[PDB]
Amino acid sequence: DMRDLTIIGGGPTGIFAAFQCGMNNISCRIIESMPQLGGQLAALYPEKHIYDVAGFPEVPAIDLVESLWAQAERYNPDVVLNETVTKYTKLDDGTFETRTNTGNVYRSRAVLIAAGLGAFEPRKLPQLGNIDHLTGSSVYYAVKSVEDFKGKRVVIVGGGDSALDWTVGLIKNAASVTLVHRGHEFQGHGKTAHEVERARANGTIDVYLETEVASIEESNGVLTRVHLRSSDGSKWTVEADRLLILIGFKSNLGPLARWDLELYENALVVDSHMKTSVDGLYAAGDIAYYPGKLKIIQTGLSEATMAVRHSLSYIKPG
Amino acid sequence: DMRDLTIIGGGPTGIFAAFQCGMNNISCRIIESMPQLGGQLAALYPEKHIYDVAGFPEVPAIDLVESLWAQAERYNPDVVLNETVTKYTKLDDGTFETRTNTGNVYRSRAVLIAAGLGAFEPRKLPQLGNIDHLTGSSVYYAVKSVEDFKGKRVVIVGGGDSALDWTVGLIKNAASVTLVHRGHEFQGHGKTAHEVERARANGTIDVYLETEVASIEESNGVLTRVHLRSSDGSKWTVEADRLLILIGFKSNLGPLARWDLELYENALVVDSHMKTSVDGLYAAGDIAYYPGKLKIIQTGLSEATMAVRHSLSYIKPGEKIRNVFSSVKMAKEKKA
Ligand SMILES: Cc1cc2nc3c(=O)[nH]c(=O)nc-3n(C[C@H](O)[C@H](O)[C@H](O)COP(=O)(O)OP(=O)(O)OC[C@H]3O[C@@H](n4cnc5c(N)ncnc54)[C@H](O)[C@@H]3O)c2cc1C
Ligand SMILES: Cc1cc2nc3c(=O)[nH]c(=O)nc-3n(C[C@H](O)[C@H](O)[C@H](O)COP(=O)(O)OP(=O)(O)OC[C@H]3O[C@@H](n4cnc5c(N)ncnc54)[C@H](O)[C@@H]3O)c2cc1C
């Protein structure tokens, strides 16, 4: 089933781009890697208020996503969720085939890369080496079940909302809870960050800022203890059964890095029409680069309008 | 006196740029030649619905202007209305002076040109010539206030919504209302045109299609009589102490076209940072040209953001810029 434009990524840029397709009477689909649309706004800061998007005095990120989506849904674009585009091919006839990780192939007359800053892979502690054999047993990047943390000695890495929340949530579940953050202070300093220090002074938990995991110990295929290190060179070891790492998400082009396209500082280089080196292949948003590019919402919206507009000369040359 | 940025023009691009100034902790002024903000939106299509602005499914143009203003008024920026910037000078210190048509001068450390397609000015009737001594007192190009027309015998010229609106508006307020328009039909339509037509029918008002104003009479420096001529050749006179001219706004790029700055088909040529050749002098919106420029609202909005962002390097030279997002930056000042 041929569409005019395949859009890779369902952040604010891909969404507005899908609206642009409707507005301009071309069919499209959005292929999105996450289980929901909204990109960085829905994932990293859904509840935080945005101030610098035109005509929205003060708007929670996730509401803006909803405003943008409602605007585009009128035109009923195909939305593919839970699929990551890993390859494409331009065919003899100029049309496109884009492939996702589930082996699904998608046909379009042209394509728009609106993939931002990656597909939200959890960031790790690579200083610990390849510890896949511990992963999902004693080392976690998310809490898919509290069972795993129950009556266990657990250290928690991070200083955002996820690391904070779970430090208090596991006090009652776990034998011990220890928070360790690289930063000087905690990020997202609100209601939940106003009462974090309590259990620290109380002695029910341990908190360490300015410290990082230096190494770990294991016995019979399970974590035994965690070595810590502060900025001043202070080093100590702590007994730990579980490691819970919540330090955000990685930022790179993922599979799109190995598409033979001009790059400039982890972004796709783009001309005055938002076109890559390959005709009918466009980029817009955080992922696109041109002299003067700002990586903000306002600017991604403009770029989506310009990509879609020029794409009409490729899709239907009239 | 001194502001960080002088913004020439208060269309959507200028209003957003003023908001951007506030976001970036710099002061500014908007200089606008119209009696209100809004540019082509307020002037040419206020009631028309806009569909292609991000996050707005449907919005009357004038409501969009209102939303953008509501956003900008957070920082209470200076607003100079009814003045047209005619020139600028870059002084020896690198700061700027802008001069308007009323002889006022404004100082700033940098300037953004967000002048669109030109200064909007009320269209005038040449057949009357220089009547500036009557303008503001017995002759008007817009209703500055309704009290100007209370108990007056008024004539209104035009066939759009504004002419139609104030015709029915001033019926109970004024003592005599005459509407003239040089077209054979009214271009404003709907609720208003029929109210006017019903008022014509029972003779509460005079209305004359295909009629243009020929001449006026005046006594004591005030309007006294208006002379009209139809399309068939008719020619008559009304007793009128008030004349309201409402035949539209005209865009006039004139003064800025005579500046020493490169143009591409009436647009000021700009670089990757929305800067013209003169450092500290920026352009954004419909007035800005760079390869691939689309003359639309969405595009002027992000251009305003890029121009204000870079202007910081000229306004505050050498100063290290801290790349915070608005969301995080407004959270830090909510804590403090
Ligand atoms: C904490 C924080 C606060 C911010 N606050 C502001 C602010 O106040 N104002 C502002 O203007 N900007 C702000 N930003 C930046 C803003 O979020 C981004 O500029 C914006 O999200 C860019 O949208 P985008 O569509 O270009 O990219 P993204 O939001 O990154 O969306 C890209 C989408 O593509 C998907 N994807 C990636 N690869 C593939 C693949 N190969 N196949 C299928 N899908 C894929 C991803 O899952 C993602 O949904 C903030 C950023 C952060 C982190
Ligand atoms: C009928 C019509 C419908 C349109 N519909 C849409 C639409 O649906 N969607 C869309 O995206 N775009 C639309 N547009 C285009 C859109 O209006 C413009 O892109 C937009 O107005 C540009 O904004 P701007 O602020 O940069 O310029 P402008 O809106 O033109 O504002 C410039 C302002 O500067 C003032 N000015 C100029 N020179 C001086 C000076 N020397 N001194 C003081 N003040 C000065 C002017 O009076 C004016 O108020 C439409 C245009 C028209 C004519």
- Residue A93's CB: how many other CB atoms inside 10 A? 7
* Type and span of the H or E element at B222: strand B222-229
Q: Which of A55, A292, A299 sits opposite B55 (nearest CB)?
A: A55
Dihedral, CA atoms, B310, B311, B315, B317, nearest 10 degrees? 20
- The answer to whether residues B227 and B214 touch, using CB atoms and an 8 Å cutoff, is yes
What lies within 8 Å, CB to CB, of B150 at 6+ separation is: B173, B174
Selection from B265, B284, B266 nearest residue B275 by Cα: B284
* Helix (H) or strand (E) segment spanning residue B188: none
State whether the beta carbon of B307 lies less than 6 angstroms from ligand 2: no
Secondary structure of A179-235 as H, E, C letters? EECCCCCCCCCCHHHHCCHHHHHHCCEEEECCEEEEEEEEECCEEEEEEEEECCCCE
- Strands B139-140, B242-245: pairing kind: parallel
Longest dimension (CA), chain A: 73
Q: Write the CB contacts of A215 (distance below 8 Å, at least 6 apart in sequence).
A: A127, A128, A227
- The count of C-alpha atoms lying within 13 angstroms of the C-alpha of B304, restricted to the half-sphere facing its C-beta, is 36
Q: Is B53 in Cβ contact with A54 (below 8 Å)? A: yes
DSSP H helices in chain B: 12-23, 39-44, 61-72, 161-169, 191-201, 254-257, 297-315, 326-335
For the four alpha carbons of B93, B94, B99 and B105, in that order, the dihedral sign comes to negative
Residue A82 backbone dihedrals phi, psi, to 5 degrees: 60, 35
User: Cβ distance A32 to A80 under 8 Å?
Assistant: yes
The Cβ of residue B28 has, within 10 Å, a number of other Cβ atoms equal to 28
User: CA of A151 to nearest chain B CA: how many angstroms apart?
Assistant: 36
Query: Alpha carbon of A262 to those of A257, A277, B80: distances in Å?
Result: 10, 7, 47
Per the structure block, which two tokens stand in for A209? 């800022």
Distances (CA, A) of B296 to A252, B84, B172: 32, 23, 41
Distances (CA, A) of A182 to A58, A179, A272, B188: 31, 10, 41, 65
β-pairing, B49-50 vs B59-60, is antiparallel
**B55 vs B151: CA distance, rounded Å:** 46
- CB contact B305 to A (< 8 Å): yes
DSSP assignment of B152-180 equals -EEEEE-SSHHHHHHHHHTTTTSSEEEEE
Residue with tokens 């292609």: B52
| Dihedral of alpha carbons A137, A138, A143, A145, sign | positive
Annotated binding-site residue? B286: yes
The 3-class SS string of chain A reads CCEEEEEECCCHHHHHHHHHHHHCCCCEEEECCCCCCCHHHHHCCCCCEECCCCCCCCEEHHHHHHHHHHHHHCCCCEEECCCCEEEEEECCCCCEEEEECCCCEEEEEEEEECCCCCCCCECCCHHHCCCCCCECCCEECCCCCHHHHCCCEEEEECCCHHHHHHHHHCCCCCCEEEEECCCCCCCCCCHHHHCCHHHHHHCCEEEECCEEEEEEEEECCEEEEEEEEECCCCEEEEECCEEEECCCECCCCHHHHHCCCCEECCEEECCCCCECCCCCEEECCCCEECCCCCCCHHHHHHHHHHHHHHHHHHHCCC
Q: How far apart are CA A261 and CA A263, in angstroms?
A: 6
* Cα–Cα distance list, B11 to A7, A171, B8, B19 (Å): 32, 56, 9, 13
* Tokens standing for residue A268: 């796709």
Contact predicate B119/B252, CB 8 Å = yes
Closest by Cβ to B327, choosing from A23, A48, A291: A48
Are the beta carbons of B273 and A292 separated by less than 8 Å? yes
Q: How far is CA B228 from the centre of its chain?
A: 29
Residues of chain A contacting residue B57, judged by C-beta atoms under 8 Å apart: 67, 70-71, 74
Provide the shortest C-alpha distance from residue A54 to chain B (in Å): 6
CB A124: neighbour CB atoms within 10 A? 15
CA distance A32 to B156: 58
Interface residue A295 vs chain B (CB under 8 A): no
Atom of ligand 2 nearest to the CA of B100: 42
Residue type, position A40, single letter: Q
3-state DSSP call for residue B16?
helix
CA of B5: how far to CAs of A132, A137, B98, B107, B111, in Å? 56, 59, 11, 9, 5
Token pair in block for residue B249: 């706004």
CB A213 within 8 A of CB A123: no
C-alpha–C-alpha distance, residues B21 and B309, integer Å:
9
Q: Cα separation of B11 and B29, whole Å?
A: 13
First vs last C-alpha separation in chain B: 30
d(CA A208, CA B101): 64
What's the resolution in A?
A: 2.4
CA distance A129 to chain B (A): 32
* Cα-based angle A116, B271, A112 (whole degrees, multiple of 5): 25
Beta carbon of A300 within 6 Å of any ligand 1 atom = yes
Chain B residues closer than 8 Å to A298 by CB: 301-302, 305
Choose the residue to mutate in B31, B37, B40 for probing ligand 2, maximizing ligand atoms within 8 Å of C-beta.
Answer: B40
Burial class (CB in 10 A: 0-12, 13-18, 19+), B73: middle
Going from the C-alpha of B264 to that of each of A245, B75, B256, B287, B288, the distances in angstroms are: 55, 34, 13, 10, 9
Tokens representing A40? 């960085």
Question: What structural domains and CATH numbers belong to chain A?
Answer: 1-121+248-318 (3.50.50.60), 122-247 (3.50.50.60)
Nearest of A297, A58, A57, A49 to residue B73 by alpha carbon: A57
Whether residue B132 contacts residue B256, with contact meaning beta carbons closer than 8 Å, is answered with no
Query: A36 C-alpha vs ligand 1 centroid, how far in Å?
Result: 13
> Which technique was the structure solved with, according to the deposited record?
X-ray
At A203, list the tokens: 């002695």
The residue type of A130 is N
Q: How far apart are CA B215 and CA B85, in angstroms?
A: 32
Q: Inter-chain contact A70–B57, Cβ cutoff 8 Å?
A: yes
Contacts of A302 in chain B (CB under 8 A): 298-299, 301-302
Mutate to test the pocket of ligand 1, among A56, A251, A297 (most ligand atoms within 8 A of CB): A297
d(C-alpha B309, C-alpha A15), whole Å? 26
A55 touches chain B (CB under 8 A): yes
| Nearest CB to A53 within list B55, B273, B309 | B55
Q: Is B113 exposed, middle or buried (0-12, 13-18, 19+ CB in 10 A)?
A: buried
Whole-number Å distance between alpha carbons of A306 and B288 = 16
Q: Does B130 touch chain A (CB under 8 A)?
A: no
Identify the bridge partners of residue B85 per DSSP, sorted by sequence position.
Answer: B100
Distance separating alpha carbons of residues A205 and A37, to the nearest angstrom: 37
Report how far residue A6's alpha carbon sits from residue A305's, in angstroms, rounded to the nearest whole number.
15
Q: Quick check: A70 and A38 in contact, CB under 8 A?
A: no
Kindly give, in sequence order, each residue whose CB lies less than 8 Å from that of residue B78, ignoring residues fewer than 6 positions away: B3, B27, B28, B29, B30
d(CA A253, CA A116): 8
Q: Which of A13, A15, A20, A40 to mutate to test the pocket of ligand 1 (most atoms within 8 A of CB)?
A: A40
Q: Can you tell me whether residue B297 is helix, strand or coil?
A: helix
Cβ pair A298, A54 in contact under 8 A: yes
SS3 B93: coil
- Please give the number of the atom of ligand 1 that sits closest to the Cα of A53: 11
Report the 10 Å Cβ neighbour count for B221: 9
Nearest to B112 by CA among B317, B310, B308: B308
Hey, how many other C-beta atoms are within 10 angstroms of the C-beta on B280?
A: 21
Contact A297, A53 (CB under 8 A): yes
Question: Residue whose CA is closest, atom 14 of ligand 1?
Answer: A296
Q: Are B192 and B169 in contact (CB under 8 A)?
A: no
Cβ B284 vs Cβ B306: under 8 Å: yes
Query: Which of A53, A71, A273 is opposite residue B292, by nearest beta carbon?
Result: A273
Q: Do A68 and B52 touch (CB under 8 A)?
A: no
Name the amino acid, one letter, at A309.
R
What is the bridge-based pairing of β-strands A211-219 and A153-157? unpaired
CA pair distance A212, A226, nearest whole angstrom: 10
Point out which residues pair with B218 in neighbouring strands: B223
Question: How many whole angstroms from A290 Cα to the centroid of ligand 2?
Answer: 26
As given in the structure block, the two tokens for residue B186 are: 């009214």
Give Cβ neighbours of residue B265 (< 8 Å, ≥ 6 apart).
Answer: B289
Residues 6+ apart with CB under 8 A from B157: B125, B163, B179, B180, B181, B213, B243, B244, B245, B246, B247
Structure tokens at A281: 């292949």
